[PDB]
Amino acid sequence: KKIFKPEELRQALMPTLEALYRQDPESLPFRQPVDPQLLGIPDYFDIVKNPMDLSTIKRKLDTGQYQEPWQYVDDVWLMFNNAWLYNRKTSRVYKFCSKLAEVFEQEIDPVMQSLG
Ligand SMILES: CO[C@H]1CC[C@@H](n2c([C@@H]3CCCC(=O)N3c3ccccc3)nc3cc(-c4c(C)noc4C)ccc32)CC1
């Protein structure tokens, strides 16, 4: 299938990550990995087996760790689904997660079409 290369992926995908970072305050819980010790939620890693956050995804884009666009998309939805799994539907963080998902879905669709 189509072979991609890192700089092509970073230039195409990074604006979609940038759109998530620009959401203030909705992206604030997601700009750094969850620290369950500081936040007093010691069961976090009992529930969330593969943590993900914007800073990790950004580093992976920056350092060429995605061979295909769908791997980037996978990590974004993984970050969203970790937050939806751990938090109550009525919580601020759950709602901010859904806001980021709405933004992502608008940003990623034209990009993935253009990478196809
Ligand atoms: C800059 O560093 C800050 C340090 C930690 C702060 N934080 C908070 C605080 C608690 C206090 C009440 C509040 O309103 N907060 C907040 C809510 C939205 C916007 C800004 C502040 N609750 C958090 C929940 C998760 C999380 C996720 C994601 N998935 O599971 C879990 C669990 C992660 C970070 C959280 C966010 C950023």
Numbering used by the authors: 1082 to 1197
Which lines from the publication concern this structure?
Many proteins, including the EP300/CBP histone acetyltransferases (HATs), contain several targetable domains. EP300 and CBP broadly regulate the activity of other proteins through their protein acetyltransferase catalytic activity. These proteins contain several highly homologous domains, including KIX, bromodomains (BRDs) and HAT domains, through which they interact with, dock to, and acetylate target proteins, respectively.
Since recombinant CBP BRD was more robust in biochemical assays and crystallization studies, Kd values were determined for all compound-CBP interactions by MST, and co-crystal structures of the CBP BRD with five of the seven analogues were determined.
